[PDB]
Amino acid sequence: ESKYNENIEGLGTATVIETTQNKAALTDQVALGKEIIAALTKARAALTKN
Amino acid sequence: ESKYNENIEGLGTATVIETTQNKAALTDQVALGKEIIAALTKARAALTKN
Structure with missing residues (x-):
């Protein structure tokens, strides 16, 4: 879903592109x-940052 | 900063360019x-001196 995120947290959700x-x-x-390993590192980071 | 590293001696701070x-x-x-690894070792070096 586009252009929306719950509240204005500074939240991103985010999807890491390959x-x-x-x-x-x-x-x-x-x-x-x-x-997939690289992606798991990066997703761990994205998820951690929030 | 431009100049303005107090006193003078063996002191300027290093921004390690990548x-x-x-x-x-x-x-x-x-x-x-x-x-980031190589830069970290370089950083350790720069801090060890002075």
Whole structure:
């Protein structure tokens, strides 16, 4: 849902976009895991910051 | 600050610039992590002297 966030907390919710691009371009079945690890770090950070 | 580092002696404060291009250009987890490590060691060095 667009343009809205509950209250004006400085809250973000936020969704982390994947490093590089194209699922089908990744399909190594390895490094995809590296992307998920990286993403888990970053999501841990985003979630922590709020 | 411009001048105005009290007394004089062996004292100015160091802002450790980060190598590689500007922040928007490096865009990585591993790269940024590496840079923060190297910068941390450099920082330890700069604080150890004086």
